[PDB]
Symmetry: C3
């Protein structure tokens, strides 16, 4: 049929008019880089040989990093989806829906650190998605086993009864009440229903009362009672001890249950808390996700799993349909491991002082990855296929064995064999809660492959990268869905401390992956993994190692300003021409990067600032911790990470002052290369300006101990450099 032959989606290669010059000047800049290195190596500095050697090592490292970064971006593409064809094929009006089932996972660890209002908003947004109510289920994992989360979910389930029909009737976007009622956009735009105003006022008042109720619940649960927590029916709370409690599973909505305001049903909401016992490693988020996968397979057994963070809400209600446009395709859907959505955040400054938007990565590197094998699974907002998580190869590219791979639960083994999802027919519905409690036992993952070859992979802080790499080495492919309206939105870090800690955590995870047996350099040699994807994985693994060449280079001018030497033997016409050509090539290549990627100058400029800041601050301590773990067994706002950048900044300032005094006030005459000498320090201080702005400005603050340490280290370094 003509309708059946029309694809549900199609790829849009970057038009040749914008991709041919990109490749041309990539090759050209490679040529000038090689010529520049040939010039630099063969002409050293006689009286400053050590400085020349350090500098040439630094640019060699920089060029290697640039090559490894630029190579994956050879073939960027875009992807376009058609929801009307999906409706024609699977969601035809009148006929029953043929869409596949969906499970959406949310994970929370502490109601004190993560306010229950945000989790309630996320749950409300998920429950109001534009999907059949019987084909979508929501699972919430609570690692803290706190009754506050249970009561917040119980109240959110009662508010959903009123919120979901309103959104479905009036096409409200976004479905999260907090972000919808706080929007400055005209809410009467494109609204045609005659009863919009009264119902909107009523639902706003109801939401305000719900917020007050949630605040009261939070206030009441602030202090633990003497005899532990108790429920509303007199029974004590099983999760009184955070580190010692049995597994708990509760169902709030769905089949049977209770209907909503319009009389229809609502998506099933399940509260799951895995068993915790002393002396057992729970593996934190990876173990929680594995337990959620097992529970969802036991109860609902949807064939696709949505990973949503607690602070991320479904902004676009059509995200599930867009995911199914790829995942339900008869040909591509078999070979797809997951669908990845871009990460967007709200509440960010207009200038994005901390580069929280991160436009450069998600709009250049992700698109380049999508053109070879698929984006790397990062963060949240990912639609995984169950068959990929089970350690199976791509279809289109032995009971004892099953018990050795999945576990000792035969119901889960039976559920794993359902291609289209759903509860297996040869399974009693009455005995389903007991098996779901069994699969979250602390000792279930014994002598099995969970966390090693199937599910989320342990052994690293950033388990997402490891899971994506393990799926990709099997030969699976991934897509990078980029909807017109962003599918998911979250909350950006407020101050610099949280961003620095997050960058340090990412770098530590990358280092741990590098030192483990799952390194892309020497793992995955089966032929399934593509060469360019392997290079991208290596680049994402050994990126923090570029901290050492950075921290030396930023310290190069100040030493020059405190010793009297230059890295260039003598300024010549040939050398000046080579330097100018290299700078022009770099600037032009960046220009076409913006042109094809659609990124403004401000965003990429501040992204470069933040990249330099991160490499100088967090990656250095990441490498220090890695070396300490290699050579020993020691380990650690954290007032130590800011010591290197501030020390280097004031070293550069002192060196600038000393050089100006020495070569102008006293010497003068033929000052010489002092113009570029000061320009280099100006570049360094510009790249590290935000630290000085925070230290000297407002809305910040640094303890005196770290400042004293930095000043003492700077004075010691300056005295040693002057003496030697």
């Amino acid at each position: 049929m003509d309708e059946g032959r029309q694809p549900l989606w199609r790829k849009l290669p970057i038009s040749s008019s914008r991709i041919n010059p990109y490749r041309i000047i990539i090759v050209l800049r490679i040529a000038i880089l090689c010529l520049f290195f040939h010039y630099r190596i063969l002409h050293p500095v006689n009286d400053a040989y050590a400085l020349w050697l350090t500098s040439v090592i630094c640019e060699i490292w920089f060029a290697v990093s640039w090559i490894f970064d630029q190579f994956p971006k050879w073939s960027p593409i875009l992807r376009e989806t058609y929801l009307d064809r999906l409706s024609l094929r699977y969601e035809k009006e009148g006929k029953p829906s043929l869409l596949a089932d969906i499970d959406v996972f949310v994970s929370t660890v502490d109601p004190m650190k993560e306010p229950p209002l945000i989790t309630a908003n996320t749950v409300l947004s998920i429950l109001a998605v534009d999907y059949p109510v019987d084909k979508v289920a929501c699972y919430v994992s609570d690692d803290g086993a706190a009754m506050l989360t249970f009561e917040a979910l119980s109240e959110t389930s009662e508010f959903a009864r009123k919120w979901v029909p309103f959104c479905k009737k009036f096409c409200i976007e976004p479905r999260a009440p907090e972000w919808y009622f706080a929007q400055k956009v005209d809410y009467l735009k494109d609204k045609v229903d005659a009863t919009f105003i009264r119902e909107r006022r009523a639902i706003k008042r109801e939401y305000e009362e719900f917020k007050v109720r949630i605040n009261a619940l939070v206030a009441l649960a602030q202090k633990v009672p003497e005899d532990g927590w108790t429920m509303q029916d007199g029974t004590p709370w099983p999760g009184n001890n955070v580190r010692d409690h049995p597994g708990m599973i509760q169902v709030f909505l769905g089949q049977n249950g209770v209907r909503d305001i319009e009389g229809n049903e609502l998506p099933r909401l399940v509260y799951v808390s895995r068993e915790k016992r002393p002396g057992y490693d729970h593996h934190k988020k990876a173990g929680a996700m594995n337990a959620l996968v097992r529970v969802s397979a036991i109860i609902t057994n949807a064939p696709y799993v949505l990973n949503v963070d607690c602070d991320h809400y479904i902004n676009n209600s059509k995200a599930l349909r867009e995911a199914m446009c790829f995942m339900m395709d008869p040909t591509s859907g078999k070979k797809i491991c997951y669908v990845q959505f871009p990460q967007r955040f709200d509440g960010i400054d207009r200038h994005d002082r901390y580069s929280n938007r991160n436009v450069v990565f998600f709009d250049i590197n992700m698109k380049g990855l999508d053109g070879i094998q698929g984006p790397i699974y990062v963060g949240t907002g990912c639609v995984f296929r169950r068959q990929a998580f089970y350690g199976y190869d791509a279809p289109t590219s032995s009971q004892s064995k099953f018990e050795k791979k999945f576990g000792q639960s035969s119901v889960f083994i039976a559920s794993t064999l359902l291609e289209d999802g759903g509860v297996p027919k040869a399974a009693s519905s009455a005995t389903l809660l007991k098996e779901a409690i069994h699969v979250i036992s602390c000792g279930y993952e014994d002598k099995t492959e969970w966390g090693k070859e199937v599910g989320w992979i342990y052994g690293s802080v950033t388990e997402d990268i490891l899971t994506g790499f393990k799926m990709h080495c099997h030969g699976w492919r991934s897509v990078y869905c980029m909807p017109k309206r962003p599918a998911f939105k979250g909350s950006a870090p407020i101050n610099l401390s949280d961003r620095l800690h997050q960058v340090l955590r990412w770098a530590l995870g990358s280092v741990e992956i590098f030192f483990s047996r799952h390194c892309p350099i020497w793992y995955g040699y089966g032929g399934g993994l593509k060469s360019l994807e392997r290079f991208s994985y290596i680049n994402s693994v050994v990126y923090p190692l570029t901290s050492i060449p950075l921290i030396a280079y930023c310290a190069l001018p100040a030493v020059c300003l405190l010793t009297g030497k230059f890295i260039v033997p003598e300024i010549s016409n040939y050398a000046s021409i080579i330097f100018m050509a290299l700078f022009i090539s770099i600037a032009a290549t960046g220009i076409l990067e913006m042109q094809w990627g659609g990124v403004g100058i401000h965003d990429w400029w501040r992204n470069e600032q933040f990249w330099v800041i991160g490499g100088a601050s967090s990656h250095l301590f990441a490498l220090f911790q890695g070396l300490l773990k290699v050579l020993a067994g020691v380990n650690t706002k954290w007032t130590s990470l800011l010591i290197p950048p501030l020390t280097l900044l004031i070293i550069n300032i002192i060196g600038v002052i000393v050089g100006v005094s020495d070569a102008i006030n006293n010497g003068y005459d033929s000052w010489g290369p002092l113009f570029g000498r000061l320009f280099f320090a100006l570049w360094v201080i510009v790249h590290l300006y935000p630290f000085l702005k925070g230290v000297m400005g407002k809305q910040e603050g640094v303890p005196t101990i770290i400042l004293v340490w930095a000043i003492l280290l700077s004075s010691i370094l300056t005295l040693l450099w002057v003496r030697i």
Copy 2:
């Protein structure tokens, strides 16, 4: 008269600040740290009452802009003693406090006293210092 409604609301709901104009013009989320189940309805009612109070104050200001021909007169027919700014006897009035009138909760309110010191021609009143001493 507006105090008899404003004060119990603030004391019950721990409203900060207590000035209605600055409280109702705050961009901070007013639902933060509020646990009472009847906060929204009472806040809406008190906001409407404060708007009506502002309208009444505006009407009073507009009415008193122009002095009448025979001087000012009170609401009971007696003339205003302070017709002349530089020549009037001292006036003391008590509005709230002990006895008086209770609020919407049945409790009393802090005493409010209106004091106007005597002014006569040829006498130096010393302005704010004299007013404070009086």
Copy 3:
């Protein structure tokens, strides 16, 4: 007047962008010629650049829109402007 022919309209921005990039190229070339190579008695270059600054000061919004956000032009008009600027520069250098 002379015929009977007649016509975002991506032609109106061709003259200003072409003239702006011509001024930028001329500034760069003059700085290279009269400072990097010649130096000595550069002469009235302080005025010669300054006048050009005036132009780039007055036509700054076009550059801000082209390089900034909340704007954008197709590749065809940029290619036409670059080609016209290169042709004009080559003709001026040759003559």
